[PDB]
């Protein structure tokens with residue numbers, strides 16, 4: 063039983079009429095969906111949780127529908143959001159829709175027969191829907207009394223200064239209708255999402271009964287968090303131009319022990335048997351396994367190898383294996399960086415990079431043999447960089463002591 | 474000062490930025506509007522209060538716009554309504570729209586130059602409006618925190634079983650946008666309505682500022698009520714719903730505590746004439762005659778001179794007993810709603826007509842009441858208990874009016 067398997071990974075927050083869903087799942091392939099709103103040019107790690115859950119259902123033989131909210135992204139989901147969001151333009155949302163659709167696509171199989179993935183966009187039905195049609199055909203089925211009692215919008219209905227527009231309050235009807243629309247178009251009988259989506263999902267379940275006299279189900283995944291109560295993603299984007307594969311990999315390497323086994327369950331396709339065996343062995347490595355799996359999953363074999371090669375070069379101080387693209391990752395977000403004019407001396411580099419507070423202090427630090435230039439020791443306080451030390455004519459990696467790095471990017 | 478004149482008739486509940494509105498009114502003609510939703514095939518007396526107020530503004534030189542809610546009638550106004558209304562069909566609402574627009578038209582002047590009245594319909598702009606456009610362009614300007622606390626809908630938001638749909642909750646936004654539309658299309662700067670419309674009006678004022686960067690105003694008329702606290706069922710303007718006779722009699726029977734206020738609300742008599750009529754009644758030493766004046770004015774206004782003459786002829790014939798002056802059309806007003814009526818098969822005796830009309834409990838009782846000379850047939854006394862009606866007594870071959878005592882009537886409609 064797939065629900066039982068997901069419950070064992072800790073991937074089930076809530077599920078509607080669970081016994082019936084397990085029976086329908088047991089009978090044969092179902093169509094299911096999860097929606098993703100375009101509120102940025104990329105998804106982050108949080109979005110990856112239900113995205114991989116769509117693939118977990120596909121691996122079990124079910125048909126995943128990945129919806130991108132071209133219409134809902136023009137409205138804004140208020141669910142457990144403390145503040146009203148500014149509206150985004152139609153041009154910006156369309157740009158984001160395209161980027162998200164393309165980012166989701168490699169996570170699912172679009173060519174595996176009957177259960178092949180389908181990309182959907184709710185702008186296809188809301189983009190031309192008349193307002194009186196929406197209010198009469200959809201709105202009459204929604205009770206404002208029940209809407210104001212939804213946990214997701216309750217904290218917004220106490221004081222107007224921390225309030226909600228009619229625009230964001232109508233959001234629940236759009237996602238509610240999306241479920242009914244996918245049920246009629248594709249026979250979708252299940253919607254998944256994170257726990258904040260519970261109220262938007264149950265509205266679609268109810269609306270599908272009222273509009274199409276069909277029974278549909280809901281399943282939420284817990285919102286993934288760190289055990290120490292801090293905010294998850296200290297954000298971690300899927301786009302390599304926002305979070306480099308190296309930074310992505312390092313985020314996983316540095317997972318706390320209290321989080322590492324839970325993260326392996328949420329973010330990898332490793333069996334529950336191997337994760338438990340990995341946990342027992344360490345009680346009498348997991349961060350390394352987690353980093354390898356998720357980095358290869360998001361950034362591919364090439365991405366994982368670049369992240370490992372950069373990590374190794376920084377640990378060893380030997381930079382010969384680094385390519386120009388590797389240095390681009392370091393400058394982006396890998397190590398602290400400073401832009402400098404060619405001709406600057408070593409003292410000025412240490413001051414401008416904030417590795418040293420003054421030229422006088424930097425002189426003593428250099429003379430003490432604390433500084434490396436591309437991994438090589440340089441103890442002449444009066445030194446000027448050689449042209450060959452400007453790797454790819456652009457980069458020079460400084461290190462103070464055994465671990466304090468700074469990348470000089472030459473103008 | 475038009476606002477002050479309306480305040481003296483008791484026709485002003487609330488006014489936004491009153492000094493600025495009075496200054497705008499004194500500068501020259503303005504364009505104003507009032508909306509009427511199609512929830513029935515006719516307007517009633519309540520709807521007549523703001524409709525006549527549109528005419529009062531027109532008489533002062535202003536330009537009235539009478540909007541009929543082709544779109545809003547497909548949504549439903551929840552304002553101060555205890556229960557959620559069922560949605561009406563597009564075909565039914567269209568039929569009602571046509572009937573209401575035609576019923577409204579004779580009350581305003583459509584041919585008096587620059588301030589000629591205009592007929593409008595909000596279906597013109599909502600019929601082709603996309604949902605994302607409405608939600609973004611209009612909806613972003615509305616706070617749900619403020620909406621749920623509006624007096625017109627707050628009572629609906631405590632019991633789920635006695636609740637409000639998103640459909641009816643969205644209504645305030647539609648009427649709000651209508652004011653922005655009429656401001657842009659016709660330079661409408663004022664909306665009037667009854668006091669239940671205050672919140673729908675102020676939403677339009679705020680939205681016009683946000684969308685068109687224009688200053689507009691609101692003025693409400695008090696909801697006309699009775700002094701005894703009872704409900705002001707309905708008295709319709711359509712003669713096929715409320716006959717001119719019944720309409721006239723409703724005004725005749727106005728309570729003394731209500732008659733002068735009703736003159737101010739429902740007629741175009743000057744405040745000086747109404748005050749002189751109250752003064753005369755206060756010093757006459759007899760019962761008031763103002764009800765007669767009110768009945769003549771409003772019946773002539775709504776049903777014309779012909780309607781008034783029919784109501785008076787029917788009243789006079791019932792009072793005199795002599796029905797010779799009654800036409801077939803007059804008897805049809807009586808059968809519709811003038812007096813209680815019963816359908817009976819020709820051949821029924823007087824005793825059975827008294828029992829079936831519920832004028833008597835039994836034939837045995839009917840026998841004694843007939844013998845006591847308490848029964849009239851078409852105003853003529855009939856004291857024979859064993860009497861059968863004559864063919865000549867079935868007026869126009871199908872009407873006989875029975876009366877027990879001085880006022881217990883029943884029209885027999887012969888089959």
Ligand SMILES: Nc1ncnc2c1ncn2[C@@H]1O[C@H](COS(=O)(=O)NC(=O)[C@@H](N)Cc2ccc(O)cc2)[C@@H](O)[C@H]1O
Nearest residue numbers: 097098099108109111131134139237240255256285286
């Ligand atoms: N930290 C996290 N852990 C687990 N899941 C997480 C998460 N952060 C985000 N998610 C989930 O990732 C998904 C996409 O996030 S989202 O774009 O903010 N979601 C939304 O705004 C949905 N209303 C989108 C939507 C859903 C269905 C529709 O028919 C239409 C639109 C949601 O299911 C959300 O719960």
Ligand SMILES: Nc1ncnc2c1ncn2[C@@H]1O[C@H](COS(=O)(=O)NC(=O)[C@@H](N)Cc2ccc(O)cc2)[C@@H](O)[C@H]1O
Nearest residue numbers: 508509510519520522542545550648651666667696697
């Ligand atoms: N007893 C009464 N006394 C005085 N005025 C009364 C009344 N009963 C009804 N009215 C008024 O008669 C007018 C029409 O009544 S109604 O058809 O119920 N009105 C409505 O439902 C409004 N929402 C119509 C409307 C108004 C403006 C728009 O842009 C669109 C529609 C309103 O101004 C109402 O306040």
